[PDB]
Design a protein around this nucleic acid. Sequence first.
DNA 1: TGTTAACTAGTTAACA
DNA 2: TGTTAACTAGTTAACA
Lengths: 146, 144
Amino acid sequence: GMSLANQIDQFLGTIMQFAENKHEILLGKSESDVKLTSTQEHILMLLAEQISTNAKIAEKLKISPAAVTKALKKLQEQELIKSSRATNDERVVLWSLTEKAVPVAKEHATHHEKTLSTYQELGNKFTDEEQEVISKFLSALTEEFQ
Amino acid sequence: SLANQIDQFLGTIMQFAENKHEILLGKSESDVKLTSTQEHILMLLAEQISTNAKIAEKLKISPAAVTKALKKLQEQELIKSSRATNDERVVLWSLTEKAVPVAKEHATHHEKTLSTYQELGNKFTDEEQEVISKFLSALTEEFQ
DNA sequence: TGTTAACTAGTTAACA
DNA sequence: TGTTAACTAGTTAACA
Ligand SMILES: [Zn+2]
Ligand SMILES: [Zn+2]
């Protein structure tokens, strides 16, 4: 049962489980003590980079604006982000981090890198020629999900 | 580079996934619409008469998720109860007739999705096929 | 074991 | 655009 097709399926199935019911894949658990949802972390990492609106965050994360609304209303209660109002001739509602939020931001940021580093640890382990064969595979499959 | 592509791959999936727990290419063709998880159950019962706690072991979900799914399935009259010959307390679920097509279908969708998986693997040569298939293996270790 | 209830993190739709 | 309300398919925990 070592078939290639079955080898793929079993590895899609394997990742579904590992992810549990979250929507992102990282290695190890969060440095902060079981603080927020991954999606709530990731949003804070985005806000550190650049402050934004509901619809922007929705697109970055490929989730609905209702989902973003709820995430933000939570992040707010944890006094982790502030709104801006539409007060001035601005009319835009902009959400930025709070002092309390930058530590966790860096926590999540780095946590994404470690995971990448590991992939990178897994990466160079093949020969350069072997690598570009992978890259052509990934690309073929990813297209099957489009 | 490369890792970025992996990641990107993983992330492409999380999206194709949504709330579903497995991954199938193309829309379900079932004459009746159920959650994939509901369909997969009917496929399961077609192999072996089974209890809640086993369906829950096979789907890796919780028994509460199973109770719910099973009540909805029962709501459309696709399954039926029966007790174990060993212990009469023990409740075993099996397909009604109206269910055999559907279970067939959801088996077919796994198949037609494996077919699609094969079409793609074949476009690489066996030289390239086992270098990749031991890449998958090398990756599944971070996940165990 | 498996049912409930209370909860979660997302969905669609309607609507200022 | 983005909040809210009604929904959904899972979760954990208590306990019938
Ligand atoms: Zn993230
Ligand atoms: Zn299935």
